[PDB]
C-alpha cells in the first residue's frame, strides 16, 4: 500500500514507477530493505548483482517503494541516477546533470564545473548540507573510476552486473545477490496478468514454456 506521500517523494527522486505487470519478491525486497536499513548513518555502499535481466533494477525501485524503511530512516529524499556505460567525457555530463538536479534553489553557482572532482565537491557538499539524509541509487555501472567519481562519502548504492566494480571504494560494503530464478507459482501469476485470465483458465501449453 503506497502512501500518497511516498509517491510525492519518489516523483522528486525520479525513480521509474514499477511496470504495471509486476510480481513482488517479498523475501528479496525484505532482505535488501532490512540490510539497506543497516547503514543507519555514516557512509556506506550496497551492491546488488545478477546475470542479465534478473529483476535487479525493479527490486531497487521496489525496495524504496515502501513507506516504512524510507520514511523513518530517510529524512533525505532519494535520488536515482542512470549511469549506464560511459567514456570519460560522457560520465562528466551526468555529474553536471546531477548537480543541476540536486540544486533546485540555484543558490550555488549557475556555472558548472569542468572538472570531475569539483562536481564531486558539489555533490558531497550538497549531500552534506542541502540533503542531509539522502540516498543515491545507481543503475548499471561498468567500471571502477565511475564509482571513484561518485565516491562522495555519502551513501550511494549501485546495482549492477559486475561485483568487482565496488573495489576501489572505501567504507562498509554489503552485497545482496539476485540469482535469476523466479517461482513457478509466480510466473503463472505473471503470465496471467500478461494475458488477463484466472490462472486455471490458462491453457495447458502455458505450464511448459515457463520451464
Amino acid at each position: 500500500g503506497i502512501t500518497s506521500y511516498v509517491r510525492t517523494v519518489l516523483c522528486e527522486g525520479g525513480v521509474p514507477q514499477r511496470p504495471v505487470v509486476f510480481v513482488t519478491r517479498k523475501k528479496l525486497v525484505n532482505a535488501i530493505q532490512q540490510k539497506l536499513s543497516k547503514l543507519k548513518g555514516e557512509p556506506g555502499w550496497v551492491t546488488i548483482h545478477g546475470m542479465a535481466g534478473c529483476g535487479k533494477s525493479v527490486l531497487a525501485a521496489e525496495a524504496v517503494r515502501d513507506h516504512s524503511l524510507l520514511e523513518g530512516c530517510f529524512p533525505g529524499g532519494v535520488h536515482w541516477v542512470s549511469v549506464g556505460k560511459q567514456d570519460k567525457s560522457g560520465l562528466l555530463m551526468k555529474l553536471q546533470n546531477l548537480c543541476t538536479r540536486l540544486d533546485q534553489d540555484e543558490s550555488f553557482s549557475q556555472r558548472l564545473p569542468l572538472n570531475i572532482e569539483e562536481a564531486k565537491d558539489r555533490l558531497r557538499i550538497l549531500m552534506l548540507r542541502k540533503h542531509p539524509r539522502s540516498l543515491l541509487i545507481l543503475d548499471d555501472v561498468w567500471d571502477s573510476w565511475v564509482l571513484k567519481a561518485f565516491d562522495s562519502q555519502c551513501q550511494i548504492l549501485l546495482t549492477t552486473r559486475d561485483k568487482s566494480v565496488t573495489d576501489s571504494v572505501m567504507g562498509p560494503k554489503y552485497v545482496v545477490p539476485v540469482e535469476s530464478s523466479l517461482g513457478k507459482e509466480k510466473g503463472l501469476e505473471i503470465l496471467s496478468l500478461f494475458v488477463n485470465m484466472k490462472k486455471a483458465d490458462l491453457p495447458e501449453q502455458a505450464h511448459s514454456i515457463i520451464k
Binding site: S144, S164, D167
Partner: protein
C-alpha cells in the same frame, strides 16, 4: 615475509578473502620473492607492492638514476661502511655521501648515524624489488665491483685498520660468486694466508659457511679439495682460536692422502726449511689418529652442560 609493510598484509589479506583454501600457496609465493603474483584492487592506488616501488624509482635525475642500480648488489641486511660504495663508484668520499643523503631523503635507503661511520641499508622489500627489477644487470655488475677493488687493495694488501675490510672479508667472498668467475674465486678463497687473516679477526666459522656456498660455485673435483680443507678445519676449531696462533704451516703437515691442502703444505715447509725454523717432520700419520668430524671450544672456562635444539639445527 611481510616485514610489516601493512600494504603487503592488506594485500595478502584481501587476497585471501576470495580463496581461503589456497593458504599455503601464497606462503610459498612470498618464499619465491616475486610480488607480481600478489594483486588486489584496493582503496590504495596500486595493484601491488612492486607497483609502488616503480613509482618511486622514476623521479631521480638521470645522472643519479644509474647509480641506484649499483646499489642493487648490496645484501638484504648489511650496513656497509661508506668506503666500499666509494670504491665501486670510484668517486671521492665527500661527494659520495651527499648523493646517498639525497637517497635517504627519497626514503630509498635508510640512514645509520653510528658515530662518524655511516652504514646505509634497505628493507627486505626494497632489496627484493631490486632483484625483481635489476636481476639481469646484477650478475654483470658483480664482476664490476671486484675489478675496482683490484685497482685498489689486493686481498693480501688488505689491512686490519681500514674500516671497509671486514665487509671485504665477510662479503668479498660473496661478490666473486655472483661474478661466476671460479678461477678468481680460486685466486681468493683458496689462499691459505687469506684464511689466516680471516680466522684472525673473523673466527673459523664464517669460512666454513662460505665453503658450503663455495662447493656449488666451482668444480666437483675441487669439492674434494674443499673436502680436504674442511678436514683440515676439523683440527682447527679446538685450539686454533686461542691466541698463540701456532704456526699452522707447521701444524698443517699432518693431513693424510695428499689432496690440494697437503700439497700446499709440503712445499711451504720446504720453503721454510732452507731458511730455518727447525720444523720437525712426522712419519706416522697414516698409522695414527681416528679423526673426529668436528671440535668446538665455546668457553675458556670449563663446560657444565650442553643440549641439542629440538630441530637439531643448533646446540
Amino acid at each position: 615475509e611481510c616485514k610489516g609493510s601493512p600494504l603487503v598484509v592488506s594485500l595478502i589479506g584481501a587476497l585471501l578473502r576470495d580463496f581461503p583454501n589456497r593458504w599455503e600457496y601464497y606462503l610459498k609465493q612470498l618464499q619465491n620473492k616475486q610480488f607480481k603474483r600478489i594483486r588486489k584492487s584496493s582503496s590504495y592506488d596500486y595493484e601491488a607492492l612492486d607497483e609502488a616501488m616503480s613509482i618511486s624509482v622514476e623521479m631521480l635525475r638521470e645522472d643519479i638514476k644509474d647509480y641506484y642500480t649499483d646499489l642493487s648488489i648490496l645484501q638484504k641486511d648489511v650496513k656497509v661502511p661508506t668506503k666500499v660504495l666509494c670504491i665501486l663508484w670510484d668517486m671521492e668520499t665527500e661527494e659520495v655521501e651527499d648523493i646517498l643523503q639525497e637517497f635517504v631523503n627519497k626514503s630509498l635507503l635508510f640512514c645509520d648515524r653510528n658515530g662518524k661511520s655511516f652504514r646505509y641499508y634497505l628493507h627486505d622489500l626494497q632489496v627484493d624489488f631490486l632483484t625483481e627489477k635489476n636481476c639481469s644487470q646484477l650478475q654483470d655488475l658483480h664482476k664490476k665491483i671486484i675489478t675496482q677493488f683490484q685497482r685498489y687493495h689486493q686481498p693480501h694488501t688488505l689491512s686490519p685498520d681500514q674500516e671497509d675490510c671486514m665487509y671485504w672479508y665477510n662479503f668479498l667472498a660473496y661478490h666473486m660468486a655472483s661474478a661466476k668467475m671460479h678461477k678468481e674465486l680460486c685466486a681468493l678463497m683458496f689462499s691459505l694466508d687469506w684464511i689466516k687473516a680471516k680466522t684472525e679477526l673473523v673466527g673459523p666459522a664464517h669460512l666454513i659457511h662460505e665453503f658450503v656456498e663455495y662447493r656449488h660455485i666451482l668444480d666437483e673435483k675441487d669439492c674434494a679439495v674443499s673436502e680436504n680443507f674442511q678436514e683440515f678445519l676439523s683440527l682447527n676449531g679446538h685450539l686454533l682460536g686461542r691466541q698463540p696462533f701456532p704456526n699452522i704451516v707447521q701444524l698443517g703437515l699432518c693431513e693424510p692422502e695428499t689432496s690440494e691442502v697437503y700439497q700446499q703444505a709440503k712445499l711451504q715447509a720446504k720453503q721454510e726449511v732452507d731458511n730455518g725454523m727447525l720444523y720437525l717432520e712426522w712419519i706416522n700419520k697414516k698409522n695414527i689418529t681416528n679423526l673426529s668430524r668436528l671440535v668446538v671450544r665455546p668457553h675458556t672456562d670449563a663446560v657444565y652442560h650442553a643440549c641439542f635444539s629440538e630441530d637439531g639445527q643448533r646446540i
